[PDB]
């Protein structure tokens, strides 16, 4: 299951974004102030791809047919079929450390669905407050609002 993660992380801009992939760190909140979910080539992605059904769900690498691949997203035929799991949004980190999104985890402009890598992809949501949300089939997930 681990091999299904894109590891095309090259920090050519030298921002140090990769360390928060492996360690929670201390989010650097200082410096802080419309695509549909198609298919995503895997060699542009660094780390896990999270789609929200709204419940957080990890998307693994597949080929162009939906067959799981286990090459860490190295071959060009590795993709992320985001349009196969439909409010619906996805997010991930591209190779040079930018947060990519399609439609993300924002149920509202105010609240965002929590998941293990929320603060990596969105470092400016750290001071947000979490609380349980129940809503219908029922989804058990947590949200982060101002």
């Amino acid at each position, epitope marked *: 299951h681990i091999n299904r993660t894109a590891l095309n*992380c090259n920090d050519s801009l030298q921002t140090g974004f990769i360390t928060s992939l492996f360690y929670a760190k201390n989010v650097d909140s200082s410096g802080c102030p419309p695509r549909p979910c198609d298919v995503v080539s895997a060699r542009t992605v660094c780390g896990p791809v999270y789609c929200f059904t709204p419940s957080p769900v990890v998307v693994g690498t597949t080929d162009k047919l939906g067959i799981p691949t286990y090459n860490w997203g190295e071959n060009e035929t590795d993709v992320f079929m985001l349009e196969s799991l439909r409010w619906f949004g996805c997010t991930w980190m591209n190779s040079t450390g930018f947060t990519k999104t399609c439609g993300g985890p924002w149920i509202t402009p105010r609240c965002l669905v929590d998941y293990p890598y929320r603060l990596w992809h969105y470092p400016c949501t750290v001071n947000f407050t979490l609380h349980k949300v129940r809503m219908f089939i029922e989804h058990r997930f947590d949200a982060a609002c101002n």
Partner: antibody, heavy 128, light 108 residues
Framework: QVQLVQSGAEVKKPGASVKLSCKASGFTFRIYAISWVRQAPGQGLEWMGEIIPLGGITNYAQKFQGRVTITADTSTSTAYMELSSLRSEDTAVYYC?????????????????????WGQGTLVTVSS | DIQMTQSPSSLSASVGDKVTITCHASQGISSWLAWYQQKPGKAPKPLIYAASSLQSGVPSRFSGGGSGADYTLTISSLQPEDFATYYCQQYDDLPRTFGQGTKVEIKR
């Protein structure tokens, strides 16, 4: 499989430097944190630093931040530990250990946390 | 940093007794706590990770528990191979820090 093999037991003089190597095998080198832990004779374990070979993610204990450098070389999957300005206090058994990262605590589901694999250790004596 | 203190620092027991070692942390470490067993001359052997979860291959007589800033390692009944030194180690924060160790020796 999954083993860390260590060697380079060396006797050095004060002021010199020593370079210790750690050949990893049996797991994906890039993803795990190769950490270094030393044990002075009759003393406890002391964590020195860790490297994550993919991003070259290094972190050191602050006491060693101006003497130790840890390097990856993902080609041969061999973590290195270079300690300079050697002191008599650096006489110790230096261990290589594999530590899990956030990418394994999440989206792995294959158990085994902490430092779950250790090298044999190499003994380094520093004396005049 | 996070200071890890164990209790007791020395303990004398015989074969078949139940042992509990305490490990205290200067902050809460969210059960990110590991236990190792070291015999003199050998590398530490991984024992427990994540406070409660058992490392690969170790017998069921070892177990760990706790939460927040206080954890415990318990051996159901000691066996001759179990006499050694035991270290705890938090991995919630950097630097990783160990406790001073507890030496479990044979009673006679």
């Amino acid at each position: 499989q999954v083993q860390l093999v260590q060697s380079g037991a060396e006797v050095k003089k004060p002021g010199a430097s020593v370079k210790l190597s750690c050949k990893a095998s049996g797991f994906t080198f890039r993803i795990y944190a190769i950490s270094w832990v030393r044990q002075a004779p009759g003393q406890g374990l002391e964590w020195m630093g860790e490297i994550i070979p993919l991003g070259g993610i290094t972190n050191y204990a602050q006491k060693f931040q101006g003497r130790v450098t840890i390097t990856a070389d993902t080609s041969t999957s061999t973590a290195y530990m270079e300690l300079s300005s050697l002191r008599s206090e650096d006489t110790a058994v230096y261990y290589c250990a594999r530590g899990e990262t956030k990418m394994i605590t999440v989206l792995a589901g294959t158990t085994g946390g902490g430092l779950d694999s250790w090298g044999q250790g190499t003994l380094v004596t520093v004396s005049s | 940093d996070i200071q890890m203190t164990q209790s007791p620092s020395s303990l004398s027991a015989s074969v078949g007794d139940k042992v509990t070692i305490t490990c205290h942390a200067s902050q809460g470490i969210s059960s990110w706590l590991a236990w190792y067993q070291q015999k003199p001359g050998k590398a530490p052997k991984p024992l427990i990770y994540a406070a409660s979860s058992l490392q690969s291959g170790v017998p069921s007589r070892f177990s760990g528990g706790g939460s927040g800033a206080d954890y415990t390692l318990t051996i159901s009944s000691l066996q001759p191979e179990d006499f050694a030194t035991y270290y705890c180690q938090q991995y919630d924060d950097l630097p990783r820090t160990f406790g001073q160790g507890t030496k479990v020796e044979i009673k006679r």
